[model samples]
Structure formats: C-alpha cells, structure tokens
Target: KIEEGKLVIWINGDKGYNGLAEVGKKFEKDTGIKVTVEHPDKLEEKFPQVAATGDGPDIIFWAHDRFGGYAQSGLLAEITPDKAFQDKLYPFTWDAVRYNGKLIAYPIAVEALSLIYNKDLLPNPPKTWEEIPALDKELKAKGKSALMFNLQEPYFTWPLIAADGGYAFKYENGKYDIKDVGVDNAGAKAGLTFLVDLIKNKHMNADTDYSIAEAAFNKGETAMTINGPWAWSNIDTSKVNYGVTVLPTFKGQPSKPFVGVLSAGINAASPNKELAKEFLENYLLTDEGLEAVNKDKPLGAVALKSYEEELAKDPRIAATMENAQKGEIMPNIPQMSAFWYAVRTAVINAASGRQTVDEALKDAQTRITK
Candidate 1:
C-alpha cells in the first residue's frame, strides 16, 4: 500500500550519496514525484539516533546491521519484500536482514572476498598458499612485484580460509552462536599462515597502508593483491589483464568471504510510502534502473533477479557470483563489534611473527565468542 507522490531517502556518505544522486533523478522523472535524498552529519552514528526520532527518510540505503538497533527499538519499519522483489534479491544475501525469523530490507548491492592478481604479470594467478610465496620469489627475482594484503582489519581473514569450512559463527536451529568460530581452524591456519608468510617474505611488500597496497597493484609494483570488490575501480585493469577467483582454499577450505548485501528499507511514516515504493519498483527493480545503478560499478548486485546481463560479463563480477553460492554476509549483530578489535590484535600479532598461529587463533576465538 504505497502512497504515490513523495519520496525522501537517506543515504550514507559514499555510494549512498552517489547512488541517490544518480537514481534520485530517475525516480522523480519516472514517477512525477519529488525526491529528497539526504546525507546528514555523522551519517553512520546519527542515522540510528535520528532514526529513533521516526523523522528519518522514507527510504534508507544502509548496512542491514546498522538498522538492527532501530529494529530492536521498534523504530524501524519492516520491509516485506514483494514476491517479485524477493526473487530479485540474491539468495546468499538473505542472511543479514533475516533477523529473528523476519526479513526487513531490499537488496541493493553485494560484496565478497577473492584472490585478485595482475594476470598480465603472472599470466596465471597462484592457486594455493605454497604458490603465493613461490610466485612472490619469482616476481621479486625479476625485480617486478610481490603479493600485498590488508593487515589492518581481521575482517579480511575469514574468506581466505573459507575453503576449509571455517566460519566465525554457525547458525543452528536458526540462531547464530559464535561457539562455532573457526578463526584458527586448520585450513584457516594454513591460509592465514600463507598471508603472514607473504608479509614476512623478502620479495613481499607488507605495509598496512591501503593506499600503498592499491598503488602497488595499480602501478605494477605488485604482482598480486588480495582484497574485496571495492578495489575494482582502483585497479588499472587496462594496464594489465587481471583475474579474480575465490581466495585459495587451504586444507580444503576455499576462502569463504563475508558476503554483505545492500538493501533498501522504506520508512513506515514517510509522507510518500507509495511513491517510495513506486520509485523503487520502477527503477531499482527494472533492467533500465538496474543497469543504471550497476553503472556505478558496484562489486555485485545483491538483487539477482533483474541482474544486468552486460555487467555480469565482467570476469571480476562473474568470479564474485561464482563465490556468492558459498558466501556469508558479514554479520550485522551489534554485539559482534566488541569482538572486532580483539580479533585484529590476535591476527596481527600472529601475522607479525610475535605469536604462533595456534596461539593467536585460540586467543581470537576466546575474544570473538566472549
């Protein structure tokens, strides 16, 4: 039951603003409605606070987890994705917004982890932990490049060890309990060890500076870089052929990346719920609009139904979809935030050679599941 004339939207700083900036125009044009897209101060922290006021915009582009607190407070609106729209959402992406057995948002985008490398330089990307260092040695010997990875956040580690069936948590009987933490599982250990070994290798350039890492890959200073889809735009694929695949599996674990879905949730009290729904129905769910948004060069579309045929041709995107079958959206649980730091500390210490793999992981599990 959408009231069709006004549409006000809330977007985060980056894609949120840019997405609305682009799509907002189309929404208004197609529906003959006014579109108010706002990105206010401290968008992240203030969103939930402002959301509590119920004065928030009718439609919000935000992380599924970011709205959990509001949902718990009974301030956020429940989005019953239409059957048509439900099919549009990527199946693997349904996890994050499916809270307490109810779904609450519309899928907008998605992200996953993969092993990315300069195909022009290596011709073939390394397929396993042993291959990375071996490739690093060859590249360095030729004074060419080395492997680079993010050590800044423990977030990057999960998917790299996904092959061994490692996961931070497991859902049993419909509840997520961290007691299933696979932080340092054997496959995870081998893969993480490979990551650590990359940092320590003489040929490897192991700086945590993201800019440095991106530049290294872009400027041909590095042969391979492991990261998420956001790095696609930063990469100069024109200069070199590139390949992307699931992070190499160790001990039978393919790098299981955290899958994150972008969703659109309409405000219950908005002056134009109908218009908002209409706008979304028209552009966000149509090929024309889907193509337009995909033009934003997103990593992947969380909505699989109206997927853009052309965009899916990109090898990077195809690889992403290939991994989507096994991907898990990063948990949005607020309680999980407390575990973020301690996990970083443990992984960093282990990767830095200050602690053994087993010890670092044991401590990480304790901290994460605490």
Candidate 2:
C-alpha cells in the first residue's frame, strides 16, 4: 500500500465515468488510503491547461495512437514490457506502446472497422466490389441499402485499400517503411468506385453521424452499416437482432479493417507514479479487467486470445472473430496527422462535386504528406 497522500486518478467523464465519483471514499476507507480523481471528458481542454504549467493528471485514459506528440515531446514516462505483461498481453494489443520501441501505455479497449448487417434483413452480404452494383439493384427492389458505404471520408477508405491487397505502409527492414502506400492502386480504385457509385446512385444515404446512424439502423431505415465495433451495442440491442462480419473481399483476400486501441497511461508527474503503474497493470492486464473492458463496451478487447469466452458472454460482440487478424493498426506515425486532414479535404471536395477525384487525390497526397 502507498502513502495516504500520494495517489490521484484522472479519468474521462465520457463513457459514464461520472458515477464512480464516490467510489474513492470506499477505496480509502477500506485501504486506509487517500486518493483523488478528476473527471475531464474533454481531455484537450484540460490536459493542455495543465500541461502548459508542467502539472497535469497523475493518470489518464487516452487513445494509444494519438499520444505521438506526447511521446516525442518528453512529456511522458517509459514503461517496460515486464514479464507479467509480456506473457499475457495480446500480440496486437502490445502495439499501444510499440512506438519507437518504447512502452508508454497499457491498452484497454479496441476499436476497428467492421462490415455489419442484420441477418434478418439480408442474409447475403456482398463479398466483393464487383458484386456490389448488382446487390445494390437487388436491395433497391427490396428497399434496403446493400453494402452500406459513403466514401467521402478517407479514413472510411481503409477497408477498400485493404481489400485490394493494399496497405497504408509496408512493414519491413525492422520497421514500417512508407515506400508503398497503395492509396490509389487499381484494386483500391475499383473498390472505391463502388462506394462512389453508391453515393451517386443514392444507394446509401449520407446522413451518418453518431446519433442519426444509431437511429437509422435500429429502425431498419438502413439494413447495413460499415462502421467500427463501437456501434455494436446500439445495433445488437435494437428491436431487431443484428449480425456482423469483417469486410468481405472479391478475390478471397480478407478486407482489412482499420484498427485502433484505447490505452491507459500514467503521467510522469504523479507523486504516486509507481503505485499508479502497478494499479494500471493490475486493472488493465488482469483477466478480470480485460473481461470488463470487453463486456463493458460489451465489445471485443485487444487481448482477444484470452478474453474469447468473456467476450462471447456479451451479446453485442461483433460476428468477426478474426477482426484483429483482418485489420491494420491505425498508424501512429506523427506525419499521419498531416496526411489525415488532407485526405478529408480531398474526399469532401469530390463528394460535393466541387473537385474531380483525380485532382483531389493528387492534391491530398502532396499537402498531407508534407
């Protein structure tokens, strides 16, 4: 047990972290401890205000991918791949801290793109882009959107890039090499064309947002939606039972869904840093905690190998068992932030018919990667 005045935890107010406010009193009473917690749902708002003063939360819940700026700026601590964690952590899960070969965060929840459909609506999901057009026609007769896609967002294009045996970057020579980012390959273009046509042909509506999409699927206004596992709970628990799948491919290669994992990290400025790290290890890597995250979201965890049974206990778990295997981790490269916004600009321009696809894509490549 640590000293009474040493520990403080900062958790997100989002994800219903508010109700746990009073749990600190119980913890202190039982352990004869003193612990304080701060709930700041808007991390960007708080972290900087504190970080500018070189004083911030002792612990934080953060996305592993977005911590690049912190990692490079010396505003973080280093965690080792200790024997206890190394032995049990999922292969893909360990990626939360695999950046620059330094461990920084402990992964908690995983988010990845998924191909989802309500089996009650359409048992057969399109297995390839070539099949999408015909399926769109078929779904129209049935008044359903076949192979839901509205590719005005570049991040939304990850699966298409994956399906064509394409990738954001090549992993080789001991690290990820960017020599081949097949963003505009033939297979990618072919897959993307289906989405463009979907938009043009009005097969899928463009009114997708956190709230609207959730309502649409539940009411069966849309039969299918291509999204991340984040939507599993809302969709599964709807009035109608829903089914899920990983992105399907034309030539039998699995569609690569984008993967991003949420991780728990300790701030170096904490007086109780060691105890906090120990707490993180206990809560994040333990069988009980991983199972909690899997079931808490009632979704899959990055530690899929161990939590398989626990995950299945949650009805909302996506139907894609090999989801991790079929995904490419969202890149943590610092330059990616630049690339991402550029892609957004190009996609929006083309989607609005303000610019040609070729022009937008070419401009995105130049502006974002710079």
Candidate 3:
C-alpha cells in the first residue's frame, strides 16, 4: 500500500535540497503529497545505522558506489523501473545503479574526468599524448606548465593508468572477479611510466596536489589539467577561458577515466517504499525536476536522454558526457576499498620515484589480495 500524504528524502547539499524543494512543490500540487527534503551531515556514515532500525528517510540520494554495500546489507530496495522509463535513461547509467543483477537505484547524473585546457594558451588542444612534449616545451619557454594535476591521486590519474588496458578488477559474465586484480598488468605499467616521465621531464610539477594543480590552472599558470565538473565552480568564478574535452589518446588508445553516477534509491524497510518509488520515478526524475536541480548546481552530465540536449548546451557538459560514455564505471563493490588504498599507494610510490612502476604496481596488486 502507498503512504499517500507525504514523502521524505535525504540528499547531501543545501543547493540540491533547495532545487528539489521547487520540484517538491510541483509534486505536492499534482499528487497532493508534500515532499520534505533534507541535507544531513555524514549521510554515508549515518544512513546504515538509522536504516538498520527501520527508521530513516523513505528515499536516500547519494553516489551509486555506496549502494552496492547498502544492497548487500539488505538496506536498499530493488528498483525495477518499467522498460519505457529505463529506455529514457542512458544505458550506461544502469551499470552503476545495479547490484548483483538487480536494479537498486535511479541514476540522476554522471561524472568523469576530462582534459580541461586553457583556450588562450593553446588554441588547438592536443589530441594525442605525443603532442605533449612539444607543447610542454612551448609552455615552458613562456614560463607556464603544459599540464598539471594531482600526481598522487589515483582518481585523477586512473585515465592515464588505464590508457593501455589496466583495470582494478575484471568484470566477466556480469560480475567482478576481485581475485583477478589487474593493476600490475603491462598496460597499467605503460600508463604509469608515462605519468612518471612527465614529472621527470619537468612537464608537470611533482609536488602538485589537487588544490595546487587546480589553483594553478585557474590562475592561468598551466596550459591544461585533468579534472572533473566539480572543479567548474572555482574555474567559472576565476573566469579562465577554458575548454573541456576527452583526454588525449595514449599510443593511439583512448584514456579511460572512471565514471561515477549520482543516484536516488528507496529504503528496503520503509513502509512507504511504493510511494517513495512513485515519487522518484514519476516526479523527481522528470525534466522539470532535473532542470530545477541543475539550475541550482548545474549538472555536468545528465543520465536521462531527455535532458541531455538541454544540458549539453554548455560545451563543458557536452564534453563530460562524451568522456563519460567512453569511460569505465568505478567498481562499486566493498572490495573497491582495498583497490583505492592499493592504487593510491602505487601512484604515490611510482610518481615520487620511490619505486619503479613495475615494483609499485606489483606491490599494489599484492596489497589488494593480502
């Protein structure tokens, strides 16, 4: 039975809630059900505890990564949208929202790292890694760095590390083989070597962390950077003339960035589960609802095809969607925790010259299985 009068949802941000509040008003008018949106601190940490007691928001909005654990723990409901609704969304989005062959959430947006370049400095962006050296030399002569990004952060470097063919785990027959770690493979080695070479050749600063790299790019001190849409707010405020595109191909193969999906899911224990699903599928995922949210926070890549054309009017959004389509979804299983620690350590060791790429990745693979 549906809980007819009201629905409660927990999302993360003030802007997100505010935007949804507008949509909530519409939902209330159409269905005569009031929607209460909340921005709770430590949602990831607190949700499980509250949900375990069978008391929490009817719906929770978060990145899809956590839903794997939530579904495994019996905290999330299986969300089976009809074929018509499923066809309205990008096919790739389903890859993120599913767990063990069951749908667990409705995806709202997708995010992936892309090459963001300074337009004034490089009128034509490099389309291949081979072009970087000459571009570096030109930028250096002009007292600027050709590229800058967090060298030690695997999230920022994964595209390069995956350029040749590296992956955290093999997905075969619709499941991840956690035992088959691929970080130390030949393809990953080739990619990591290219990253280390950039630092060794002084094309990028070895000490540049996320903030440092982003700040430098915003200040127009770097010709290009590897970043995602989250960096857009600062860049827009800084008013840098920039263009976003897919990362340059490495050795004729494309760099595959990790794509993340933000989604909304129903609580398995909620008595209002049917109402929650109805609110999400009928009201919240609609064009008006998504547009309101995007107006507040500006979605980089929309999951629904109906909204893509309107959102892609911003070239940055268009490029992000393009790169997202070309990228791989980050593994959403709990074992992914081990992968994060291991890969980050490998990137740090190799980039800092403390270990050879071969040695670093070997250690990373061992660490994951250990």
Candidate 4:
C-alpha cells in the first residue's frame, strides 16, 4: 500500500458531490488520511484520457451506464463486494453496476421516470393508456393538460417504447445482442400510435418542451407530467402538490422506464489501488458514509437495504422505488449512441405524424444499424 498521506478522487460536477466532499472531510478527521475531490471538465470523456496515462484519481464517480464501456476499455478495475455487502442491495440496484457479470462499481443512487401528478386535479391517476383520453377530456374542460412530458427526448418516451415490447437491444446469454434492435417492430408501432393519438387530438403537442411542460404543471395549467429525480431541483414544490406513481400500463403491458444508477468505480491504472479499496470499504461503503451520499433526499432507491427502508418512509421515494423496480437497466455499450440519436427522431416524427410510426421507426433502425 502507498504511504497514507493524501489521495485524490473525482465526482460528477453536480450538487451531490458536495455531500460526498463533506464525507471526505470526515474520513480525514477519523482516519488521518487527507483526501481531495476534483470535479473536472467533461469527466466522462476526460477520465479515460487521464486514466490511460495513469494520471487519474483513485476513484471516479459517475453513472453506471458507462461502466460496461469503461470495463471493456480496461479503464475500470473489477470491484468485488463481499457477500455481506452484496446482500444489502436490491437485485435491480446490484444489476445496474455490474458489467460482464462483474461488479465494476459501487452503486449509490438509482433513478427512473414516474408519473408525477397534481393531486388536486387527478386524485387518482389513470391506471392505463385507455383511461387517458377520457381523463384528458375532463382536464381540457378545466383548461388544464392531462399529461405532459418532453416527447422530444427519447429518454422520456422509452417507457412507451418498452410498454409495447420495443427494446434497444435484447439481452441474451448475459450479453446485449446488438443485432436484435426492436425499435421498429409491430409493438413499437402500436405504442407510437397511442402517443400520436394524443397529439392528433390536441392533448399534447411536439412543441411542448420540458420547460413548457414543467411550468404548465407548476402553474396549474397541467394535471400531470412524467419526469425523474433530476428535475426535482427545478420544481417549485410550493406551487404544485405533486404525487408520484409508476407509469401507467399501455395496452396490456407496463410502461418500463430505464433505470440508471450513479456509482463510484476504481481506476485500474491508479498507483494507490490498495488505499482506494480501503477508503471504499472503510469510509465510502459504510452506512454512515452513505448517509452523506444521500444527505438531502434519497435521489432514488439507495442500494443499502437500511437506507432503502428509511427512504421509503417518504411516499415519493416509495413510489420511485416501486417504478424503478419494474424497469430494466439502461444498456451501456457503444451501440447506445445510435439508439439515442436515432430513436429520438423516431419518437418525434411518429408522434407528430410527420411520418407513419412504422416508417419513422424503420428509418431510425436503418440509421442505427448503419
């Protein structure tokens, strides 16, 4: 092990870093080990560059969706949590941080979209897609929107795609089959058709971006909106008494949002590999340490069962976990780049009726496979 003088770490340049930065303070006071956390520019893109040169920090915090690529690139060390630690997390949470059947990162926060609604307008949120049109009519009569989400973004529309059995890449034999793209199939068309019907009937329009939809909901012009915990900071909680629930069913299937986990991974090239593991085990993974990781509110379902149970006391957290449990982890391979750009266009064009759902998705698949 290297001399225990000073160690460096990196985290996403987000507010959550502030909490962990404080935990670093506690680690110094208790263990007499000084630590430094830097939120460098373009971390996801930059970390690999620095790491390859053996100049990166001991630990880097980021979304788990990148772990697979990092592991494949030989940038991340295989992280094997003990059986006792592994048992503390939910199966889904654990699944999110694993790449190539190896635990590649320490899972921290979980996130997925949910049907967040204004309780006063819709005391009971619709249970299925079939119920939305009727509910829309009533909301329209009150000069309010029944539902709104950033349809322009594929992330928000993924649940619709999934509900109709469309998937980016089929997971078979513990690996994602890139050849099996499902975005342009019959099930996808059916789901997009339902989405188009809402726009065609003036229920929601493609012009409604995230800001417009969020403002409308907060201003009482909309009854519901679909969003994730990332948007919680912007919402004026005083103006909207919102409640969260799982996405409603579409036809016969549930709307399955993409679950993402934020996690910390060790740099395989770091000189202080042993010290990094010590810090992760003794300070970062401990229950008290994780408390700092989620001092504000559980951003999503925390991996630790104790924290998950504690977080569930908040009805919002409970609903988030409920929806998150139903979701599949986002695919982390390079093919995901094609899925994002191509499918976003498909979502917009199909919903706007600029192209038939089948035609739009077919073109998207063409672009993806190319």
Candidate 5:
C-alpha cells in the first residue's frame, strides 16, 4: 500500500542537495506531504539497483545523460508537461531531458563554459578569437599570460572545434545520427588550426595543467581563462575580482559550448507516480521552488522563463544561458564513453604539434566509429 503524505527522493550529498532539502521542507509545509530525501553513497550505481527491485525512490535528482539508458531499461516515467510548463523552458533544456521523443526529466540547472576573467586585467574582454593575439601582446607587456586553461582537458577544447562547425554526430530530425562523425571536417580543422597557432606562437602553453592554470588565475598571473560553474566556488573573491561571459567568438563564430543539464527524474515503478509528477510540474518548476534551489549555489540556470530571467540578473547565469543557447547538447548515449578518450587525444596531439590537425582528427573519427 502507498504511504499518504510521504514521498522518497534519492540524490547525492553535493552542495546542490542542500537546496533540494529546502524544497522538501517548503513542499511539506505547503501540501502536508512529507518528502524524505536520501543521499545514498555511490548514487549513480546504487539507484538503478534499488529501482530494479520495485521499491526505490519516487524521484531521483541527477544528470540527464543517464535518461537514455534508464528509459531504454523501462525504469523512468515519461513527463509530458502541459504547454504552460513546456513554454517556460528553453528549447535546448527541453531537448536535453527527452529520450526518444519523450520527456523523462525536469531540468533544474545548466552547466557550460564561459570566459572567466580578472576584471582589472581586461576592462573589455575579447569579442572574437582574432582578438586574442592583440590581447596576448597587451598582457605580455604587463608580464601576464593572455589566457590559461588545462590544455590536456578535452572539455576546455571542444568548444574551439564546435564553434567552427565540428560535431561528434549530426543531431537532427529529433535524434542523433551516430554514423556521421564530423570531427575531421573543414570547420573542425579551422578551429584546431587556431588552437595550434596559440601554442605555436607561445600565447598558450601545453605545460600548464589544470591546477597550474587555476593557480595562475587566482594569483592574477593570467588575465583570463575559459572555465565553468564549479570554478566559481573555488575562486577567492577577496583577491580576484572576477567576471564571467560567454566564450569569445572563434573566427567570428561564437564558441558554442557543450551544455550538461542537471535535472530531476521519476522512477517508473513508483506507486506515487501521479503525486510525484504533480510535485515536479506544479511545485518544483515554480518560482518558490527555483528560488529555494538556486540560493547560494553556483548558478542554477533554471529552465523556467521567469526564474531564468530573474537568475540572469546575475551575469554569471546570463553568460551561461547565452553560451548554452549556442551550445551543442551533450550526447546522452553509452557510446559517448568511447568518444572521450578519442577526442581528448585529438586535442592533445593537435595542440602539441604531434600531428597535423586533419591527421589527428581522422584518428579520432576512426576510434569513435569503432
């Protein structure tokens, strides 16, 4: 028998969960429904096992990428939000939570790259990839590097290729075409060449690892860098006056980033499916819910128009949304596992001058398709 006035939720104990706890309390106060939120260690691995037993949580707070696999396994409930709720979200946010044309999750926040700069270092941030060289020289005169990022990390480099027209696969007709990998295409080559020039010309060094880049930025040793939301929590506001904006354009084309969505999912076998659905569509997406969830965490990037517009009042969220709109949605497939190693090597090799851009990308394509 179902327990009235009660629901169970499984989520990780990251800082975001504190926000979710607030929602649980608010929801309980308003509806007399007691929401119990649990943080199971190894949530990613443990949740599926619990769900398979038909006694798992009514709701799960996690990333959207797992939706494809969970939906395929018949473990997720389809969420068909009415037009009112549907209209509030951006197109890409809506797209991110869907699997096989069915909505499987409610999006909470978006994660994407933006230019994080020391405000004192650059009064005006560069607007295009072409502008970096001039900015590089200006920073040099001041004894600072123009930019710093972990060149070895592929996430930081994918935007360069994507902005110039590269893609892992063609996402069209409401689905991804895996057979058509665009890594070695002309657009990708153009972007890769730009990155190589940066390394070749001593503007950006391959030796600067992630820690080195972050330390340089914190000490104001570097003028600017490309990073994401998590960087905000780590930055010391007492020292570095920071500002964030969308990635500067690459060859006049905006460096559209990869948007990874943080979202909420419903367990298919839950006895309280209707109640859970009502909570998500009616309560969680509301202004009250969003405000409680967004408080003091890294940018929430809520999907609702009202909340997102309100959050955008903070420039960080604004920059994230702008980049997200231009970004390619992160592919949500198990095959995506194969993509990481291949693409990472492509950037590392090209950036280090180990192989020509075309040759490195061709190798990437072969590995991805295999």
Candidate 6:
C-alpha cells in the first residue's frame, strides 16, 4: 500500500509549504515515508480531472468549501476522526468538513471577517451600527469616512445582511436545503437598507471594492473596515496602528460572517489511502505537526483547541478566533456558486441606487431559483 516509501500531497499554494516540508523531514526520519509536497497551477480545476483518472496525489490541502463538491462527485475519501481527535478541535471545524453526514477533511485553520479599525484614528471602535453615524459625522469634518468594505461582495456584506437572520440558503440538520433561498427575506432587506443608508449619507463610497477598501484603510482614510486575517499581510506592512475585533452589532444582535475552514483531505482513488490516513492521523494532526506548519505560515486561527492558548498569544489570532466562533459555517454546497453571483448583483444594484432593495433581492431570488 505504501508506494516506494512516498506520499504525495498537493497543496493549493505555498501558505504552509515550509512547515509541511519540515514535518515531511521528520516523517521520513521516523517512518521512512517520503512526503512530496507540490503547489500546482489552477489546482481547483486540475485536481478533479486527474483525481477522476486515479492519478491524483494522496493528499489535497484546500479550503473546506470546495471539498463538498468533490465529496459528492466521489473524488474525496471519507476521513472519520476518532473521538479524541474530534474533541481536540473546535466544534465548528467539524461542520466545515462534513457533507451528507460524512467527514471529508481534517480542519487546519479557521477564518472569519471582523472589524479592523485604526486605533489612532478612532481610539475606541463603535460597538453597534447606531454608534457609526455620529462617528461618520466626526470623520466627515476631517475629510475621511468612518467605515468602508467590499460593498458589492456578499462575502463581506453577509454579516450585515444576516445579522437579523437572513441567509442565502436554509441550513439545518447539518445540511443545506438549496431550494430554500432566503436572500430576499425581511432580515436581508434591513441589512441592505443599512448599507444603502451609509452610502446615501456619505459615510462610505458606493464604489469601494476590496482593493479600494483595503487601500483606503491602509492610507488611514477610513477609521474602520471589515476584513479577515488574510488582510493582515497588507495591514502589517502599512503604517496604521490597527486592532481587530468582532464585527459591531446590527440592532442588538452580533454580526455573523461566514466562517471558512482550511483543511486537508484524501483522494478516494489514491492507491496509498491507508498510508495517507496514517500520515495524517499520526503525524499531521498532532501538536508538533501543526506547530511545524504554523511556524512558517502562521495559520489564521488553528482548529485544534490544544494549540489555542499558544496561538492566542497573538492578539490578531485571538480576535479572529473569537469572531470565527461566533460565525456561521459557510454553506459548502455546489449551488453556492449561483448564490454568490446572484447576491453580488443584488448588493451592487441596491448599494448603487440602480434598484430598490426589495426589487434587487426579488430579482436575485428569481435568478437563483430559476
């Protein structure tokens, strides 16, 4: 079952390359198993094609969202973690890797959007949406805006829209009912209206996409912006004194961004499935193994609770973990592609005043269902 003392792993990128490589060295020393880690181009597209032919790598490291489609297509193998392993990780991590009642991956990292504010500019970030208007007035007098984000992207706006209980699909009993679209619901309307009010009142720019929002925040042109831990790469290089915290409340409810999990899974057709699982369960999932990987890449927020205290030494990681724990696991169904496109158009149309929130959401619901 072990082919030539080798186990091949295909990672999406170089995020954890060095650490995994280091662990590979130890794995080789202990078990005489050589781990070959590769970062190939267009992995999301290439993986399925090769996996279908039974020529794919033994392991695949990627975000949990993509694995649902692969699992459904019979491309990924079920990875059932024992109770000890399951208890070591945050509960939400399991939710990310499960599909149709089977676990498909091992959670590696957790991420969710949070309020990133410039401490020097605001000193104290607002705790609720109502607090923003007054801050907006104060910032306007200084030729700045109080807040900004990727206005048209549903990923960034979902917390705002869903705060009062809106969702793209009805998720229950650990599965998504894709047929039950909720984008046009009452809570969604209230959320979109809040965004529109911000634009109309000059507190934010209607055209601010991801790049624009990040640029403005980096330049200290905005007091606060919404983003995930990935934004740290840019913010760490900027001059702004920033702080990360849970998203401000909408009405009296906490904002709930979509929590995403980065995970590792096995290819169903790999001849080395047993070896792969051994490497994962015995080596990669251990504290030492996770440390080796995180030492180089610095995972957003680790899924393993045993490593939480150590990782939480970094304030950013702590805040991210808090936000992540409060978030809803993003729906991993394939129909999410349709939801993204429809909701993006709806948010853009509503934010730009091209259509009323009601009309935009109704059109989105139609587009998604039809």
Residue-level error in angstroms, candidate 5, position 94: 0.8
The lowest-lDDT stretch of 10 consecutive residues in candidate 1 is 297-306
Model 2: which residue pairs collide?
295-298
Q: For residues 32-133, what per-residue lDDT tens digits would candidate 2 score against the true structure? A: 655566766688457646654557766676666666666666556777757766767667767656667677777766776666777777776666656766
**lDDT to native, each model:** 0.67, 0.62, 0.86, 0.80, 0.82, 0.86
Query: Candidate 5, residues 193-271: lDDT per residue as tens digits?
Result: 8889998899988777889899999998998988888778778663798999988888788896888988888888787
Provide the lDDT at 193 for model 1: 71
Cα miss at 249, model 5 (Å)? 0.9
- The TM-score that candidate 2 achieves is 0.83
Q: Residue-wise lDDT of candidate 3 within 1-370, one digit each (tens)?
A: 2343578889987346788888888878877778889988998778899998886778898888899999899999898799999998999899888788789899998999999999999898999987898899988898987888887678988898898989887877557887998898888999999888888887777778998998899999999999998888889899999999878998898899999999998888777777778778877788887888878877678898988878898889999998888887888899999999889889888878899998999999999977
Model 3: residues with Cα > 4 Å off, grouped in runs? 1-5
Which residue segments of model 4 deviate by more than 4 Å? 1-5, 296-298
Separate clash counts for every candidate: 17, 1, 0, 0, 0, 0
| Model 4 TM-score, all chains together | 0.93
Better candidate by TM-score, 5 or 6: 6
Could you tell me the C-alpha RMSD of candidate 4 in Å? 2.2
Query: lDDT (0-100) at residue 126 of candidate 2?
Result: 66
Counting only residues 3 or more apart in sequence or on different chains, how many pairs clash (N, Cα, C under 3 Å) in candidate 1? 17
Report the lDDT of model 5 for residue 141.
94
TM-score of 5: 0.94
